[PDB]
Symmetry: D2
Subunit: 419 residues, 4 copies
């Protein structure tokens, strides 16, 4: 049955009454969304599937009661995470800046790479998943059977602050969805003006401007018709600078001091972060207070404050890869950290830079020994034997040709050529 | 002002230098200049890489041979440089699997777009460039305490050139423009790999691909290393019997496809190696089974006709070393190859195994729970313990250029 | 309702009994196709719509009884064709080689550019159509109303000979479909070995090898589940060389002479082309005899021979942009040429290089005058005034800001910002 | 061997050359060398382009001014070269519309990815390169009958640098690496264009972007032309009042967004032009309405403080020339601008209008029927008639390199 424009509007209005959209504010109409959709709205299968799966995982479907992730910067890394039992992929903008962007360059984390970069790697990941799934399906290995992997993990992707204005955010959100992201995060700092020096640091935008970026992102998702998870990050815990005092909501944090650039000094900390989290909560599915120092007490303060106004709100938490865990916490505290966060409502947790540290450290570790001599000894000891020892854990890449689809394409060849 | 006569004379003179001893070119200097245009953009990375690689192969390597590990990201290559590695190997198999411009995962059958390997070569040189910018910005120059020469020569896989002689010509140019120091071409045709085995092209066609590649390098004016790979050790099929040189290996039997069956093995490999030697700077017999006896046979045969010829050797990442060789043999393997004249050695898939295994290893424990314990035990603490070995990435912000760009910002802002 | 693997096979078997697939041979099973599909088969909306529309146009839906096309090398060129009333886009590999490939280089037509190039431009075209449609929809301009354009023209794309082996063809076909092509053509020459010199020229592959490329392409489309039009081109009219004599079907054309490369000389001409067309007909939706010299008599011979075995078979015809039409044909013959071809069953006709000649000639024409002086006089006379004079023909680009979506994005901005 | 002291001295010396008269740099030679690294890859196209453009602007142009037409493909640029044009204009609006790396159609609001304009600059230089290879392969060199210098300098649109000073710095480097001869930056912020009008940034922030760009060029060691565009003629909004220099134009009124209302017009444009002059090689007052009187006002004011300053001027493709000016005024317009010191003039959207109109024109007739009649009348016959003007593309195979690659094939095959 053909679906008329009026029917599209009605169906959208109906969808917004479903449990998925409970407590979510949209400052525009269904009619407005359909006005932007065009007469043909190409389907985004990976994004639809990812968003639905991520929602399920966030609400009781996960194995541990929370989702824990590790930043992946190649499709193959993501694939190994799936094989290993990880339930969702974290896609880090920092890692993409460093070693996987479309400028083919190494950058620090300041929104320097071209805006198509993160969507490009999301696509890479979904293609690795797709080939792995094709291999599995071609051998009729089914869910519940030994050796089965559900390869299509939802991908949560870093959109920075949207690379400019509301339209840049709108376009980037669409690109994430088209690439197949399940969730996307936006933050309220402006990387472009990050202040250099000892009295520098991150700079926030007014709350109203951060809210408008979230509205732009939700609009993009609504126009495409995909219930993508939207995560609002605040940098207000550490950021003691603000571009403009134009939003009265921010006034209580302004100290009066200005920078040479004209920025306003603010009182950074948990209170400012709470202010931002409360403001963003109606416009996002999850709220995230960026933290450089893992601290359960502060995590509890943030969660309690948000939940006092927004009971049950889903929260995200980044677990620092640079914080010296052993030096600052007991082994018991380290082992229980993510569990403890989960009980507070942090249901999406991640180590942003895990993949790049994993890759870079282990490349170094092998290379340093190998370069000195007895090369094969070191390859065998550091790589080949440990691989063999992981077969019982579900590692399959010792069988390298099948892993990348040699058997799959042999089947294709055979089907083409007959027999 | 350099007239054409002058350019031709200059090229003819260059070909008399030590670099070109025993190398055959079936075309003229005039031919090369004809293709050059009036403007020839400089390829700095490729010039530096080719010169450095030649030096390493003639007395410059620490161990007397160069040993490499396939890298598939710029950051992997950078960490190898930090670790003391002298050259980078750039694997087509790894690019097919996890680093190509189709953004897809492929087996090793020339399925990815032809710009893929050059794209990763470019990535690597950019990682090297930033690392060098970082040290230089902190007053570290060649000769300074703490200086690392980050610009390792890169040797890159061109497969069989992705079609005909012009495809090989274009791919070679793209490798050089991206900054490769050396490039290898092989004599199998992936497109018709039988479900079966590998299929060779006639010797004359493989030579034509080598000629195409050398011509590209000559036109650009870069002394890129050219490596000739033969797949004749295992390939027992041949597309055509048109080259009388291949006659002795043909059995007479033909497949349904029309291929010619051949007697695969060390003798066919030797035949190909001898044929390619006059065109290439190194020859390589692709081997699936590490075997010093066969390596000695190949080297002996080549060196009987081409004394001192540089040889390359691939050390299999899938062969079960411990099961089939003693620990002593494993430890001495690359050294023993060197004594036979194998001066460029590499593990093609080292980088992808390194990356994929360790990702799995961390992820599997992390997914079970106690997540931070596993990150600390498997990654953070081992990083800390490698600081004395020269590992610097625990200082993660400086590593990727945060300090460098801070300096840029400060200079702009005054 | 969830669709099981068995149901997917049954549905495919059922689809192959429909009118779309009458007279089409597949040397593999539905079970084999599903084996390669994976558990998730992402939707290709533009390709589905394009393929269905192209089939309709080919069977009575076109305005003139045949579809006539002009090679387009930018999305904007394709957009102007749609505005002008053209019903399908031709996507030329020659034009892509010259001025629109992913190597960013200028190449002759010898399969030198990277294999992702033609899909990349197909994507560009569909995105231009998409934005134009979004603009139209946002202003509620509907079919049948004045000023309405159905922007989503089916795109027919040049896949050369698939860039290698059967798997390269398989992958390229998938890339075309994912980009949104409605139809794709493959040819039976091997560009890689095109013989240089006066006694050189195009080289054919054995008929069986050309058939296998068509099977590979159909398999790809079947796996993706899109009824993409498949066009088999033969180069046998002019090609008097053949790579191998291994197919007994080709024996009658072999002369006995060999080249230095080992190629076999053949008797080129209409008979060899007919042989190839007859062989490919069961494995393609259209057959195309590449022609350098427009000749109605030869076109009739080819059509009659194909139709003697395959009544009603759809045929394609390329109309040479380099042939000197006025010198060789009367004005009456020139004006009626495409009409006459249509009556013979050539329902898809195209000038491969029209877009590049259009672009390059007119850039030259303006530049040559402009460079000499009185610059604005020449811009006004050659461009601006002629544009104004075309408004009544439906040309809208004098209103340049709206054309590219300024009004559309203003609506987006307004919706985001409220009001 | 060139020490840092030597490199710094060399740079300091270069800044004393005629090229750098009246140019202000708020940073030191030491600062520049600090960012350069130990290896600085050559950018041949950018070096040649910048030198040639400087020559054209100081006595080399045929007419005493350079006039340009925006090009959005390499082939368009090549045809301009064939037609006698002296330089290429590279429009961001056209890239947004029909030639960006997002493969999408956008309005002119900095929506495309930042690598887009450099990508098309690369395409253009490659078209130029092949055209030159073709002529050279046929024994046509500078001085030969039939020689064309295909390597026209390219002036490219960098918008407002896509974010902060580091984004501008990186974009400038990418322009140079692709081979641009000149680059322009503007003082509006597209991201917040009000639905309303254009919005300016403070003068100091626009200057910082110019400094960032010059620094990038200095670090790479290329004397790229830097053009400062102001949008202050039409922009009546300002993001911030932080620069006291902008005070006189601020009205006091503020918008809901927090912007400052300003008095737009020629005086605000003059203010910006005077402020940017010490940093840029040319200044440009963006104009929507061709008006010689206003052009004279802007030029007069700038030249009163900066005698001889090179000016650029955009000639609107949408202004209704015939309706508003006499044919005589239209014909003399660019010449009259030249007398005022506007030495770089361009129609930004000429290429896209040329391409899109003529595609429509052919398609509309062709779709109606009698298809070949229309192709012959609109394209083929007009091409034939332009052979005496230097149009060569009727010979379509040679134009794109068929003869060149035939020569390559023949050389490889012997």
């Amino acid at each position: 049955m053909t679906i008329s424009r009026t029917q599209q509007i009605q169906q959208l209005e109906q969808e917004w009454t479903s449990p998925r959209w409970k407590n979510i504010t949209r400052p525009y109409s269904a009619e407005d969304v359909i006005k932007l959709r065009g007469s043909v709205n190409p389907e985004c299968t990976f994004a639809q599937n990812g968003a639905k799966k991520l929602w399920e995982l966030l609400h009781g479907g996960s194995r541990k009661g929370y989702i824990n992730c590790l930043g992946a910067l190649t499709g193959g890394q993501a694939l190994q995470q799936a094989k290993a039992g990880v339930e969702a992929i974290y896609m880090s903008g920092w890692q993409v800046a460093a070693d996987a962007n479309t400028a083919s360059s190494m950058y620090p984390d300041q929104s320097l790479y071209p805006v198509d970069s993160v969507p490009a790697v999301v696509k890479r990941i979904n293609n690795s998943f797709r080939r792995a799934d094709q291999i599995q399906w071609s051998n009729n290995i089914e869910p519940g059977s030994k050796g089965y992997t559900d390869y299509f993990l939802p991908i949560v992707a870093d959109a920075e602050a949207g690379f400019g204005g509301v339209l840049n955010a709108f376009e980037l959100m669409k690109a994430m969805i088209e690439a197949g992201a399940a969730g996307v995060h936006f933050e309220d700092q402006l990387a472009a003006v990050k202040k250099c020096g000892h009295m520098g640091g991150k700079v926030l935008v007014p709350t109203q401007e951060a809210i408008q970026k979230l509205v732009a992102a939700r609009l993009a998702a609504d126009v495409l018709g995909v219930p993508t998870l939207l995560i609002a990050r605040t940098d207000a815990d550490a950021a003691d600078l603000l571009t403009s005092d134009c939003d009265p909501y921010d006034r209580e944090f302004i100290t009066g001091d200005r920078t040479a650039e004209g920025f306003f000094r603010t009182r950074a900390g948990i209170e400012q972060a709470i202010s931002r989290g409360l403001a963003y909560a109606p416009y996002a599915d999850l709220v995230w207070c960026e933290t450089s120092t893992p601290d359960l007490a502060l995590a509890k303060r943030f969660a309690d404050a948000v939940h006092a106004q927004f009971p049950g709100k889903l929260l995200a938490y980044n677990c620092s890869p640079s914080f010296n865990w052993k030096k600052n916490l007991t082994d018991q505290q380290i082992a229980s950290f993510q569990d403890e966060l989960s009980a507070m409502g942090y249901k999406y947790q991640f180590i942003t830079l895990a993949g790049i540290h994993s890759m870079w450290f282990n490349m170094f570790d092998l290379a340093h020994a190998y370069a000195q001599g007895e090369g094969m000894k070191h390859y065998v000891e550091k790589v080949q034997q440990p691989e063999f020892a992981s077969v019982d854990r579900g590692y399959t890449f010792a069988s390298h040709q099948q892993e990348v689809g040699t058997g799959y394409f042999d089947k294709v060849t055979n089907i083409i050529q007959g027999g």
